[PDB]
Design a protein around this nucleic acid. Structure first.
Ligand SMILES: [Mg+2]
Ligand SMILES: [Mg+2]
Ligand SMILES: [Mg+2]
Ligand SMILES: [Mg+2]
Ligand SMILES: [Mg+2]
Ligand SMILES: [Mg+2]
Ligand SMILES: [Mg+2]
Ligand SMILES: [Mg+2]
Ligand SMILES: [Mg+2]
Ligand SMILES: [Mg+2]
Ligand SMILES: [Mg+2]
Ligand SMILES: [Mg+2]
Ligand SMILES: [Mg+2]
Ligand SMILES: [Mg+2]
Ligand SMILES: [Mg+2]
Ligand SMILES: [Mg+2]
Ligand SMILES: [Mg+2]
Ligand SMILES: [Mg+2]
Ligand SMILES: [Mg+2]
Ligand SMILES: [Mg+2]
Ligand SMILES: [Mg+2]
Ligand SMILES: [Mg+2]
Ligand SMILES: [Mg+2]
Ligand SMILES: [Mg+2]
Ligand SMILES: [Mg+2]
Ligand SMILES: [Mg+2]
Ligand SMILES: [Mg+2]
Ligand SMILES: [Mg+2]
Ligand SMILES: [Mg+2]
Ligand SMILES: [Mg+2]
Ligand SMILES: [Mg+2]
Ligand SMILES: [Mg+2]
Ligand SMILES: [Mg+2]
Ligand SMILES: [Mg+2]
Ligand SMILES: [Zn+2]
Lengths: 116, 60, 23, 127, 155, 97, 83
RNA sequence: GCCGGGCACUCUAACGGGACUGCCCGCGAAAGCGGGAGGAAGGAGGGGACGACGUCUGGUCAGCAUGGCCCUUACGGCCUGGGCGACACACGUGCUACAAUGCCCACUACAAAGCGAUGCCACCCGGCAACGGGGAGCUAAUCGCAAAAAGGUGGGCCCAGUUCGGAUUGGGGUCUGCAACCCGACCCCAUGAAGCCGGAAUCGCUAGUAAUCGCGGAUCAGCCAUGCCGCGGUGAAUAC
């Protein structure tokens, strides 16, 4: 896989493709293409192996991405769950965490309706 | 909780956040207009009587 | 869009400002 | 030297000035086609001059206030028509059959309490 | 409705062809009261049936209109314990409405990606007696012909 | 040189808005007329009954009409006689220069 | 959250009890109604009884659970599920 | 419109006029009905205010009033905390969507009604930003809220669970407030769920209406407002 650890979509503009990475959004895309002087409009198939490794090297070195990103956030909930925080019990009982009503909706955390 | 509440309402509190308006005519805690000092019920009652200066029904 | 805060149309909906809707 | 009619439509008010000249038309300090660009509904505002063959014969200074671009357009369409009737009283024939002198009181209806809008009622469920 | 028949709204003739029928067509195209876009959408297609077909746009439009206008339709009527589909002539008023409606409806069924083009090609197909716009009219007519049995049931 | 006239009822505003303007028009000399400024309106909308019944309200309004008059060429014969004027209860005045 | 420019909030009266005990060496029990408080570095190792509206809940504080509020460790609701 | 100068025009806001089947043809015993004219307006001009005797032993002893019945170291009262915000589920009203008649960025137009002296806050500066420090005007047709938005011009996206959609969560900040754990809003980085147009069934609207677009106000420290009361922009289809 190309960058970073994943193979971003060839045939799209280089800035959109990057967002197909866990950890890089629209902001971080234009932000990587600034500090490398790479045209935000060009199709990924049309990068130099030079442009590749430059764009490659910045992104991988500045930000935590794919695997490790998931890993910390995991550990972040891991600890929150394990200290017995209120936000912990909500993760451990699988319910929502941010002061939403649960009497209705709440589905995205709860899952499909378990009818009775 | 009633008369002790209209009375608790006027006295200056333990923190200024706790200021709440009580309709000066009947003591209603809800729907109290700043301009008159009244609740939407008394609002209508005094008005209909014609004891509210300059106040009249809107028709457009 | 109208529910998407990170856009122009989105912040007009809320009636607030930011990088995604400047004043 | 000049001919003025008052044009109204909705919240839009039209101060229109007819003056013999090439056929130049101006709204709020811009050329007509600049101020109404891409508005297909525009070219019809300059209709009453076709009612009496005035396409080239007059110039126009025009201010406009209130409403929107198409409410402002209909006011103009009235005002230049309004202004012609003074420049030549005999122009009444071939202006009334076009309804160019008449102005419609058609305006946005009051939002009514107990409704979503002026008429859209809230949706209702019995059983 | 109940008291007196409705007064048929006379439209403003379109500014590009002076036509009271194109205007109507526009409105059936117009979503959300955004006529400006719907006007262009039509007008662009005129340019598009100009490119691919060198003759008057308005001419393609009016024949296609005529080829989608249905002369008969069946219309419901429950006599007894069944709802009998009675055939009736379509008034010129209604033919136009259904034709203009199906034109746009069939137009929006097309796969080409821009609204201007969809209108163009369906008008290209409709004036030449092809397309879904007709596939609706033929359907409506066979349905009517099929029930000449119940033809005596006219109101 | 400025007179400002403000009340809740306009038919008593225009009475007093003319009366002050007649006075200065008497004792010299310039009256720039009773110019009626736009009214500032505070509507009150309220559910009719004391309990529930949301889809039925009543509309009340309060009209604070405005007036302005300009006595331009002073003539302090006006400076004394205005200090004695018969301006009815429901109306306020503000005097500037 | 609590505006960074201002303070890190602890109810005056409770902070003192921790600090008094710090001198003497901790720890007795601390019945409190201070949910609005922040757990604060001086509090580690103490055992604080937080009022959840009902009970005084015994919470041993650790080096890991510092930046939070107290009441996050005294649950306000009892829930065992349905059915 | 910055100064002279003017109130003509737009306007502001009070007092009038005007519309009455009054005129014409006609059908009619009449009242009226079809048509014609003049006229901005035509046959109740559009909308509003306004709801008969009664019905529902309708609703509200929790806005208030009130008979009576009941309590008196308490069924009264003061406080700190919590609950009213729970969640195997079911229903009502809604918001935002599933996209190209669309999404996004830049530049560029045209409303109205309101609101505002520990109030709205021009403008300048620090900040990606919410905001923060300066600071002018306005008891407000003067100053501010203020950009209206859909629209127009240009450019990008190219039919993809996507540059559609913005829920869920992680991390970091601003503000209001004594205090945002339960339980506020907002800003930013990252995460980017369901959803490809909805089963039986079912709602609204007859024209400046429906649909779509933004703006304000009441309550109000802040706000869970996508609610409500209004306001304009654009603007249909159809009634045999
Ligand atoms: Mg990404
Ligand atoms: Mg909750
Ligand atoms: Mg009482
Ligand atoms: Mg409060
Ligand atoms: Mg109150
Ligand atoms: Mg988006
Ligand atoms: Mg939409
Ligand atoms: Mg044009
Ligand atoms: Mg409207
Ligand atoms: Mg409702
Ligand atoms: Mg109901
Ligand atoms: Mg069809
Ligand atoms: Mg005059
Ligand atoms: Mg009649
Ligand atoms: Mg009963
Ligand atoms: Mg009672
Ligand atoms: Mg009683
Ligand atoms: Mg509740
Ligand atoms: Mg359901
Ligand atoms: Mg809702
Ligand atoms: Mg729903
Ligand atoms: Mg996905
Ligand atoms: Mg909170
Ligand atoms: Mg996306
Ligand atoms: Mg799916
Ligand atoms: Mg698709
Ligand atoms: Mg849809
Ligand atoms: Mg549907
Ligand atoms: Mg069915
Ligand atoms: Mg109706
Ligand atoms: Mg306000
Ligand atoms: Mg607010
Ligand atoms: Mg919430
Ligand atoms: Mg709003
Ligand atoms: Zn009251």
């Amino acid at each position: 896989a190309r960058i970073a650890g994943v193979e971003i979509p060839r045939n799209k503009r280089v800035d959109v493709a990057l967002t197909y990475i866990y950890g890089i959004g629209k902001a971080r895309a234009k932000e990587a293409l600034e500090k490398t002087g790479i045209n935000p409009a060009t199709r990924v198939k049309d990068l130099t192996e030079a442009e590749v490794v430059r764009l490659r090297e910045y992104v991988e070195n500045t930000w935590k991405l794919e695997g490790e990103l998931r890993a910390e956030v995991a550990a972040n909930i891991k600890r929150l769950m394990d200290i017995g925080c209120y936000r912990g019990l909500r993760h451990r009982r699988g319910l929502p965490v941010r002061g939403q009503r649960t009497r209705t909706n709440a589905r995205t955390r709860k899952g499909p309706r378990k009818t009775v | 909780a009633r008369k002790a509440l209209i009375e608790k309402a006027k006295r200056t509190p333990k923190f200024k956040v706790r200021a709440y308006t009580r309709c000066v005519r009947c003591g209603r805690a809800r729907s109290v207009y700043r301009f008159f000092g009244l609740c939407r019920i008394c609002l209508r009652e005094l008005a209909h009587k014609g004891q509210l200066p300059g106040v009249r029904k809107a028709s457009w | 869009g109208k529910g998407d805060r990170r856009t122009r149309r989105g912040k007009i909906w809320r009636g607030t400002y930011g990088k995604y809707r400047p004043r | 030297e000049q001919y003025y009619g008052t044009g109204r439509r909705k919240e839009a008010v039209a101060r229109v000035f007819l003056r013999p000249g090439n056929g130049k038309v101006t709204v709020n300090g811009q050329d007509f086609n600049e101020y109404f660009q891409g508005l297909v509904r525009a070219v019809a505002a300059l209709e009453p001059l076709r009612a009496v063959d005035a396409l080239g014969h007059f110039d126009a200074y025009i201010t406009v206030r209130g409403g929107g671009k198409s409410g402002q357009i209909d006011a103009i369409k009235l005002g230049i028509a309004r202004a012609l009737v003074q420049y030549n009283p005999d122009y009444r024939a071939k202006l009334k059959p076009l309804g160019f002198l008449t102005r419609d009181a058609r305006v946005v209806e009051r939002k009514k309490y107990g409704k979503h809008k002026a008429r859209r009622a809230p949706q209702y469920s019995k059983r | 409705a109940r008291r007196r028949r409705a007064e048929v709204r006379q439209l403003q003739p379109d500014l590009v062809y002076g036509d009271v029928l194109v205007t109507a067509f526009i409105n059936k195209i117009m979503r959300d009261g955004k006529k400006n876009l719907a006007a262009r959408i039509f007008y662009d297609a005129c340019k598009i049936i100009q490119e691919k077909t060198g003759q008057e746009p308005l001419k393609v439009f009016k024949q296609a209109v005529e080829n989608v206008k249905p002369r008969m339709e069946v219309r419901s009527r429950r006599v007894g314990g069944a709802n009998y589909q009675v055939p009736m002539e379509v008034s010129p008023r209604r033919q136009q409405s259904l034709a203009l409606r199906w034109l746009v409806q069939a137009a929006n069924q097309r796969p080409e990606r821009r609204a201007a083009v969809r209108i163009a090609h369906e008008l290209m197909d409709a004036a030449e007696g092809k397309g879904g716009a007709v596939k609706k009219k033929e359907d409506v007519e066979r349905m009517a012909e099929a029930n000449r049995a119940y033809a005596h049931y006219r109101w | 040189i400025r007179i400002k006239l403000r009340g809740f009822d306009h038919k008593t505003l225009d009475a007093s808005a003319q009366k002050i303007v007649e006075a200065a028009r008497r004792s010299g000399a310039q009256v720039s007329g009773p110019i009626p400024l736009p009214t500032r309106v505070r509507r009150f909308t309220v559910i009719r009954g004391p309990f529930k019944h949301k889809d039925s309200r009543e509309h009340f309004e309060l009209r604070t009409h405005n007036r302005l008059v300009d006595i331009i060429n002073p003539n302090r014969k006006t400076i004394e006689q205005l200090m004695t004027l018969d301006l009815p209860t429901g109306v306020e005045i503000e005097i500037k220069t | 959250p609590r505006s960074l420019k201002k303070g890190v909030f602890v109810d005056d009266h409770l902070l003192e009890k921790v600090l008094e005990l710090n001198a003497k060496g901790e720890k007795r029990l601390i019945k409190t109604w201070s949910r609005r408080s922040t757990i604060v570095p001086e509090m580690v190792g103490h055992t604080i009884a937080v009022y959840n509206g009902k009970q005084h809940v015994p919470v041993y504080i650790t080096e890991n659970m510092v930046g939070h509020k107290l009441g996050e460790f005294a649950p306000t609701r009892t829930y065992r599920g349905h059915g």
